[PDB]
Design a protein around this ligand. Structure first.
Ligand SMILES: C[C@@H](N)COc1cc(Cl)cc(Cl)c1
Ligand SMILES: C[C@H](N)COc1cc(Cl)cc(Cl)c1
Length: 330
């Protein structure tokens, strides 16, 4: 089997991407944030504290004839940006782009943090990292991809995120018309539960490529590109007037600037992020100071190839016995 679904930016800045997902019988369609950096499929629901729901579409398990409460199971997640959510668990039928999994764990939120409430466009998350990170207790549950994998034509999914435009998540096949050149594959460590890999280096604009190992994670659920302080300083030094602002929380730059591209290495291959992808717009409405899309990972503990990087590529998440990651230009 295969599936294919369009993913759409939630706003004009590509702050996140939502993909429609059918849950239950009859289907309840929710727009979920597909997140290769986590492993829980959780949704706003009829059980969510009312004051914490503000415009989201909710899953109502009592209206699904295939929903079953997973007795005694709870979940609770804290994401790296400080947001969090928790609740109980159902199993139900879940379909993405024509690919159906029966008995998928659907984690129904009883509580969500303010950042989730304040984003009316995201109805929940669909985790695509390794199932070892799933938070359901006392019996850990499998991700949608892990449940589907044996039925898929090939045990893979691909992320093709658009810049200011829709894109595609495919399951079970590689669309060879969706990229240029070849896909370069690179080794993955699953020891931390992530799609963790090592980039071979970087360049800023038309500058010389610096060969250096950068260990990080491929994370569709993180907006920005978080890299070591030395790398980030080298990038922003090429933008007149850019500076790291402790009050704002990162590098900012004059909105009138033209940003240079940023290239990252995948083996001998090179993925070029156009400068415009690095502009996240005014720091507050009406400001002429803009937020940068490349930020320091200091204090995260890991480098993160978020949407800024991934949307410059066609990305293969290969879930074979030994997982690998593939990148192509597009
Ligand atoms: C839950 C994880 N997928 C999130 O990963 C992180 C963690 C931190 Cl501390 C910061 C950022 Cl931007 C991302
Ligand atoms: C009707 C078209 N052939 C559809 O092609 C596209 C074009 C963009 Cl920009 C994004 C996506 Cl998801 C699909």
């Amino acid at each position: 089997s295969t599936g294919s679904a369009t993913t759409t930016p939630i706003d004009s800045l590509d702050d996140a991407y939502i993909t429609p997902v059918q849950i239950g019988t009859p289907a309840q369609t929710l727009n979920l944030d597909f997140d290769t950096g986590s492993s829980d499929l959780w949704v706003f629901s009829s059980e969510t504290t009312a004051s914490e729901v503000d415009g989201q579409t909710i899953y109502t398990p009592s209206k699904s004839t295939t929903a079953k409460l997973l007795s005694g199971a709870t979940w609770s997640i804290s994401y790296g940006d400080g947001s969090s959510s928790s609740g109980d668990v159902y199993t139900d039928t879940v379909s993405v782009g024509g690919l159906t999994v029966t008995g998928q764990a659907v984690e129904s939120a009883k509580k969500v943090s303010s950042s989730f409430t304040e984003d009316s466009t995201i109805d929940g998350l669909l985790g695509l990292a390794f199932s070892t990170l799933n938070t359901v207790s006392p019996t850990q549950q499998k991700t949608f991809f892990d449940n589907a994998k044996a039925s898929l034509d090939s045990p893979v999914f691909t992320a093709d995120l658009g810049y200011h435009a829709p894109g595609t998540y495919n399951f079970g096949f590689i669309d060879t018309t969706a990229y240029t050149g070849s896909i370069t594959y690179t080794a993955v460590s699953t020891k931390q539960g992530f799609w963790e890999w090592t980039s071979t280096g970087y360049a800023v604009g038309s500058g010389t490529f610096k060969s250096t190992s950068i260990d990080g994670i491929a994370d569709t659920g993180t907006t920005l590109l978080y890299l070591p302080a030395t790398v980030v300083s080298a990038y922003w030094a090429q933008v007149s007037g850019a500076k790291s602002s402790s009050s704002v929380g990162g590098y900012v730059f004059p909105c009138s600037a033209t940003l240079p591209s940023f290239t990252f290495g995948v083996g001998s291959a090179r993925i070029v992020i156009p400068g415009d992808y690095i502009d996240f717009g005014p720091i507050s409405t009406g400001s002429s100071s803009c937020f940068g899309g490349i930020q320091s990972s200091a204090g995260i503990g890991i480098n993160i190839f978020g949407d800024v990087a991934l949307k410059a590529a066609f990305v293969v998440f290969n879930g074979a016995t030994t997982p690998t990651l593939g990148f192509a230009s597009k």
